[PDB]
Symmetry: D2
Subunit: 386 residues, 4 copies
């Protein structure tokens, strides 16, 4: 039961299971993992593919010979296992040069370097099959108010993304960009801190159709937001190009717990939404096996991400298929929410005395929404106690 | 010193100083205020104008004769004092009929009522001179996951705002809408929870030019976000149609403290930004005098909102005018942030070896940003210890 | 399955199911409930008892004749159903007189009134059978820094609790006090904001044995704290005299969702802890049926509180009984945590070279904790997918 | 103006200005600092002393010869500058051996090692003059619910602290312990997460008089708590043995901004409280110069910590000395808060009809607290606009 296979589209970053366990107050607890080992182990667990930052695959500062070698061993592992690479990204955050940003660094020469580093890796991503290229502007932001003029920084961010869009267009590449929001950490405040801010920004790019979001469960939860709601807004906009699945225990540092951990009911509602919307993209885990774990715990935690998705998928499907739930949804007027409010138009609404002058507000007010009964059916289904 | 006059554009909602002090665990501590008294007292304190919900000005359920009477006394007070009404809004949250929303109520008849209630008050707002009409969807959202299908709710929200835009267009009215985000309270999660989400949503309306945001200091801070940053993004988008100024002590219930209270340095950076951007709109306070206060404390707290703005304006101006600060800004490369990254374009960037192959990442990395010295000049200016 | 009976010790405040739905932005959505109706309906659902504030049972300002009448009808309902009253409390928060506090009001005459109001209700509580008397100092605190000298306020709080302890001692009453922490709301910050602060304060009372805590799930979660951990510390101290069970969706206003809602895995770990510790007190729900609900939804939500406890109890028991979990606990050294570190004492520890000079830190470091496998067994048990 | 000198008691950890800038997503941005250089630079800035973890002063794993060398160079620098060492602590968090804790590690051999490591450094601390020995249990806690039995962990924590108290007592050392709370990070939840929880725990130690708290501004703010209030409770308990001063911008990762940054008004109220209470201990900064900074920015940020304390001290003194503020305090009944509520005792209170039967609740309720006027005087003083 609940055994993943490649059909389930589960993917993992090299940096997830490969995290050595260094944290702000601690040294590594595990050795570096060879990307080849990660591809093989994830394939054996039932994954569909892996993702990478440039610098996870090729050590920063590698010579061209070393680069080619690292790429060849990785491609051979992919080819041997049938593992795919649906997404890639750039590391614009680890090296000290990026201490004030990549695309929005105050130093212009750093901004140009950030773009060149990104473009090099776009070319590699395309060759390996990535259809989405993620940008996580983790260093874009500030600890203090005058350090960053945010309007001007947004000009530089737009310029950078427009330059990347011109590049991909000129090369004829079939790849799209996905902006991954995060509200803070490692900057005191990060630019484009939520799904909303990223969606809004995209609409001022030159070629908005080339850009979407890569929301992460834990990141929206670091702002105390409802992740399923934000995903719904991204889906409504047509912009859910990729997703990062994990867990987070509230408003704190970015934990990157395995999926299912943290806010379990939000994980349930997320899976319910992805499945009923027909999301077709990768089910990507951006998680960290806690540094308490040895390598065997790394693979257990990775397996748990997939298992939890599959359990939740089963429970959500059972919830929506239950005739008692379909009745409760009617009792709560979820069907009526889908009716247009005023397809008859403004003049007909204005002339309709049943909408105002003769509307019995007290009788309407007295009608309960029946949401608690509906939610307890949902609880029962999640818990297998339906 | 720091004496407000109407030239300063300070405005207040009737419901601010008029708050009787009822909270989730407490009865009223002050009597209801007559709108006429509020207009006169605010005028004497140096305010420029007032704002209202329909139901603050005219008691809900008033007959047409009573309505006209309430409106006439208010207009006479405005006319006598020279107080203006730059903004108005609808109460789509107090009456029990709105328990599941106005525009996104699951019951269709409630959605239609919400629109009619809004349209009636738009007509009044225009007559009184409001150029901005605020929508705060405080009841739009959910406590539980299946209660609200958010994609469908967003369809209903869009339909409602598009209907209002068709109405104002057909009447030829010179008024614009401003959506006021809030992340939660009184719903467990509110739709369009931040400035970003509201900006994003606007871009999918039929007539996006008619809609902007009315961000509130405390509301973005209820998500732990940086209010000056969010205002910067709204300004960058051309969408800061109005603002609500107040204070908030962290991630908790909506406090609506007087402006300056709560996060004082964020208040400083906000004023710095509004003044350097040339924001021309009302400086509107959406605050609650704490229920500890009697009527004399109400007016003290209102006066304090204005005084704090004026003090912060002076300090921010002194900061930006100080030659030592202008040097520190250069030292921190704020000037260089404004240079285009690659106006030379993609081919020139790709051919520029100084951007990649020959870029000395370590020398760049070693250069300090000097942000702490800059921020301590800012601190010194705020504290008057420059 | 999961049918509550009085043996399960479930109790509810009159103010829970009796909440009329007034919130900071909304009028009542339900009529007032007669306490007699609440006793009868809860008894039919399988509850064991009810709790009350003075002013829930007897309207504030009732004459002595009216008081006696309200008490008699309630006692007759209790007597008819076999419902108990294990806890009572005072309302020191609704009336405007308490706007700056009860026991720590700056006005001395208010502090004295608060004590008299409390003592009157202690006498009633004892007659009705309450063994715990809760104090929730919801108005004790401040919105601003100089309004409340906290050291002096703590002196007044101690004086009040010591006076109450002298009263109960002199009357020979068998009742204990339980302080209910909350971090904020309705005050900007509330004194004794967490379980820890309340436990600490108790140790400086004259008769500390008479005082414990009444922690509430949602209140500790309003500080982002781990409720099971705080309960563990209260149990460790011998101070878990009562508990309030509910749900909360993060760091925000006090939601008082039904138990099980909000942080579901924290609800699981809480039940696991209460059951393995042998907590014998009431399983009391301090919740609000959302104001979306009519009366039928009130009773559904109340029933859901009890059902969720019972489901979680079953899952937690199954988890701890599973041989695979008992093995995983050993693999993770939970057994070894219970061994004394150094029962051999300080001189033997200092002379033990295996504790320092000859301790192989790297071999110890390399041993994984196996916590992820353990936690995934816990997840599987919660979800019924063991 | 605002020039620190040793008389001001300012101290800094070696790890503060010595932070190399590694964060969870970034490599070091600055070179390691020699402790000798730190002592000399801080002395030149006007500091009084420095603090250390064992492993900041002596590299982990140093041979006895290397240890003695590191200690000698440091003592020579101290001796040359007149810099003191008022506090020391153990690093029980960086090495991978401590991945599940020191004193509460599930592995018993790790717990014993943690104690030996601590005892070795106590002996050094005493020699160097430390009068306070801090314990920060940053690894004590869990990411998952079954990983740590908190009651049993508290038994192990108590055992460890009792063993340390027996050791210091047997050696005759004049040193006290201070527990530094933090709610989370690097563990998902940390044991003893707040000042309150630590104060409570101390009262169950064998020799409670030997233990107090070392609260940190940012740590209490990571739980959204009021730091001045928590300090007031620690002072009220007689347990403020040391303090860590810094800044924090809300509920997020531990930022360790320079003091004054983050919540500026809380910094003001903190200084007001420390000065009026007569706190005599070190004014210790536990801060991180942001990794954006080079070495010159390190010393600017360190200097800014001290400058901000001194500015705030001046403003707080001016506030309390202002006759207008002393009148406002009376208007707000801060004087009356200091009067005993019922020194006349319980029988006299019960017989006093002015406390209940004849108390005019409405007249009392109608009296405003005048807190807003008081707080605006405080604002004016902070801003130098009095
Ligand atoms: O962009 C891919 C990844 O970059 C970094 O690893 C971020 O920490 C992570 O959240 C993001 O998903
Ligand atoms: O929309 C105007 C106002 O409506 C309500 O009063 C909200 O509480 C407030 O935040 C909003 O600004
Ligand atoms: O003290 C009993 C109750 O008083 C109030 O109703 C509080 O809101 C609640 O949290 C508390 O449990
Ligand atoms: O215990 C002294 C220090 O140990 C670590 O450096 C912690 O991060 C810090 O908060 C604490 O004060
Ligand atoms: Mn993350
Ligand atoms: Mn991610
Ligand atoms: Mn507000
Ligand atoms: Mn507002
Ligand atoms: Mn509550
Ligand atoms: Mn409660
Ligand atoms: Mn810290
Ligand atoms: Mn610290
Ligand atoms: Na590689
Ligand atoms: Na573009
Ligand atoms: Na009126
Ligand atoms: Na439109
Ligand atoms: Na009654
Ligand atoms: Na006592
Ligand atoms: Na050294
Ligand atoms: Na002891």
């Amino acid at each position: 039961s609940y055994q993943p296979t490649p059909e389930d589209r589960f993917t993992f970053g090299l940096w997830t299971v490969g995290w050595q366990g260094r944290d702000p107050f601690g040294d590594a607890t595990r050795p570096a993992l060879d990307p080849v080992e990660t591809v093989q182990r994830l394939a054996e667990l039932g994954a569909h593919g892996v993702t990478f930052h440039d610098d996870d695959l090729i050590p920063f500062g590698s010579s061209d010979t070393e680069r080619e070698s690292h790429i060849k061993r990785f491609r051979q592992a992919l080819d041997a296992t049938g593992m795919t690479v649906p997404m890639a990204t750039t590391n614009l955050f680890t090296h000290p040069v990026f201490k004030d940003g990549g695309f929005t660094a105050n130093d212009r020469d750093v901004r140009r370097y950030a773009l060149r580093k990104t473009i090099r890796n776009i070319d590699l991503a395309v060759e390996l099959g990535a259809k989405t290229y993620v940008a996580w502007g983790g260093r874009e932001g500030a600890e203090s108010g005058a350090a960053k003029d945010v309007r001007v920084a947004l000009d530089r961010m737009k310029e950078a993304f427009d330059l990347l869009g011109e590049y991909v267009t000129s090369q004829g590449y079939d790849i799209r960009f996905a902006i991954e929001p995060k509200p803070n950490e490692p900057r005191g405040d990060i630019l484009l801190p939520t799904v909303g801010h990223a969606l809004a920004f995209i609409e001022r790019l030159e070629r908005p159709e080339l850009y979407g979001v890569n929301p992460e469960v834990g990141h929206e939860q670091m702002a105390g937001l409802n992740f399923p709601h934000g995903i719904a807004q991204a889906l409504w906009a047509g912009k859910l190009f990729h997703i990062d699945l994990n867990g987070q225990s509230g408003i704190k540092y970015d934990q990157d717990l395995r999926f299912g951990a943290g806010d379990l009911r939000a994980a349930f509602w997320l899976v319910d939404l992805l499945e009923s919307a027909g999301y077709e993209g990768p089910r990507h885990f951006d998680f960290k096996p806690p540094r308490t774990e040895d390598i065997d715990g790394v693979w257990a935690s990775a397996a748990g991400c997939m298992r939890n998705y599959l359990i939740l998928k089963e429970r959500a499907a059972a919830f929506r298929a239950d005739p008692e739930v379909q009745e409760a949804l009617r009792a709560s007027r979820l069907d009526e929410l889908a009716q247009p409010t005023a397809a008859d138009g403004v003049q007909e609404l204005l002339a309709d005395r049943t909408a105002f002058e003769d509307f019995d507000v007290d009788a309407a007010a007295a009608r309960g929404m029946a949401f608690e009964r509906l939610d307890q059916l949902a609880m029962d289904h999640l818990l297998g106690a339906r």
